[PDB]
Amino acid sequence: YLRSGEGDTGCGELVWVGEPLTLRTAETITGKYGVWMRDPKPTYPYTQETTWRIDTTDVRQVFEYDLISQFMQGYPSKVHILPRPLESTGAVVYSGSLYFQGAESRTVIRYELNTETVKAEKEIPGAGYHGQFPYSWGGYTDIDLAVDEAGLWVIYSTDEAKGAIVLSKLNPENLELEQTWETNIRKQSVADAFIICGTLYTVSSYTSADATVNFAYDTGTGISKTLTIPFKNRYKYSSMIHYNPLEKKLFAWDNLNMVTYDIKLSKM
Ligand code: NA
């Protein structure tokens, strides 16, 4: 009968995903309406409030909005012109830098936003690019950057892995692959992937209404397992999903509107 408070480390396995809630979309009186992103490790001079938006190929513009009020009005505080075209599907902002795959390359670039400067470039060894290793619906999603509680990751595959998902933990400063895992999950058999507390999760489908989170790979054990967590698709097909470890929510983008999925983890 001796009782203790409910202990919690703040991280654990995913046990519940909520139904999608649609966020209010920002105003743009023009066409422009690219994917937007916030920094899970805000770094001065930016804050939790700061937003960035990718323009729309030759994608080379990134809009920066200091205040949510400026974001919601569609009025950037600064427009970044990047030194090389982007792959919009796998870019992320982390610790004050934009990390992105250079168009038609296997190279990840670190672009420091406050100095508008390339600080690191790293070819992902063996990484396929250009529809060599898509997810389950074509396009050019070969290389996918992700941020979780432990920092920056890259999701990809290689000819050596024969299409299996490979993940590498990246040094956020110099982009070295500090650790690599070769999973036994076939990349083209899932629609998308994200990472929470060091576990890789996959989305079964974006075009089925009642989809699931259907695989998990624990990087602490190297073991993959099947899951059946319900995952509701409610819109014009999401085109990408990002976990934000600061907000502890999943953000799904459908090319205009953003929805959020609440989650619950074990105390683990
Ligand atoms: Na993705």
Author numbering: 235 to 290, 293 to 504
Question: Which of the paper's sentences describe this entry?
Answer:
Olfactomedins (OLFs), modular proteins containing an OLF domain that are predominantly expressed in neural tissues, are involved in fundamental processes of cell growth, cell signaling and cell adhesion. High-resolution crystal structures of the ∼30 kDa five-bladed β-propeller OLF domain are available for four subfamily members: olfactomedin-1, latrophilin, myocilin and gliomedin. While the folds are nearly indistinguishable [Fig. 1(a)], one difference is the presence or absence of a heptacoordinate calcium ion bound in the central internal solvent-filled cavity of the β-propeller [Fig. 1(b)]. To survey the OLF triads for calcium binding and to test whether calcium binding can be reverted by simultaneously altering Asn428 to an acidic Asp or Glu, we replaced the triad Asp–Asn–Asp with Asp–Glu–Ser, Asp–Asp–His and Asp–Glu–Lys via site-directed mutagenesis of Asn428 and Asp478.
Asp–Asp–His is the second-ranked triad in Nematoda. For myoc-OLFN428D/D478H, nearly all residues were traced; residues 291–292 in monomer A and residues 292–293 in monomer B could not be traced, although several loops in both molecules were difficult to model, suggesting overall loop flexibility for this variant as well. The main and side chains of Lys503 and the carboxy-terminus form several hydrogen-bonding interactions with residues 242–243. The far N-terminal region adopts an extended loop conformation, forming crystal contacts [Supplementary Fig. S3(d)] with (i) a side helix of one symmetry-related monomer A, (ii) the outermost strand of blade E in a second symmetry-related monomer A and (iii) two loops (439–446 and 468–475) of a symmetry-related monomer B. For myoc-OLFN428E/D478K the difference upon the addition of calcium is within the error of DSF (±2°C), suggesting that myoc-OLFN428E/D478K cannot bind calcium; for myoc-OLFN428D/D478H a marginal stabilization was observed with calcium, suggesting weak if any calcium binding. For myoc-OLFN428D/D478H, the coordination environment is most consistent with a pentacoordinated metal ion, assigned in our model as Na+; consistent with DSF results, this metal ion does not appear to be a well ordered Ca2+, as poor thermal factors and/or occupancies result when this metal is replaced with Ca2+ (not shown). In sum, unlike myoc-OLFWT, neither myoc-OLFN428D/D478H nor myoc-OLFN428E/D478S copurifies with a fully occupied Ca2+, but both the Nematoda triad Asp–Asp–His and the Arthropoda triad Asp–Glu–Ser appear to be able to support metal-ion binding, perhaps in certain bio­logical contexts.
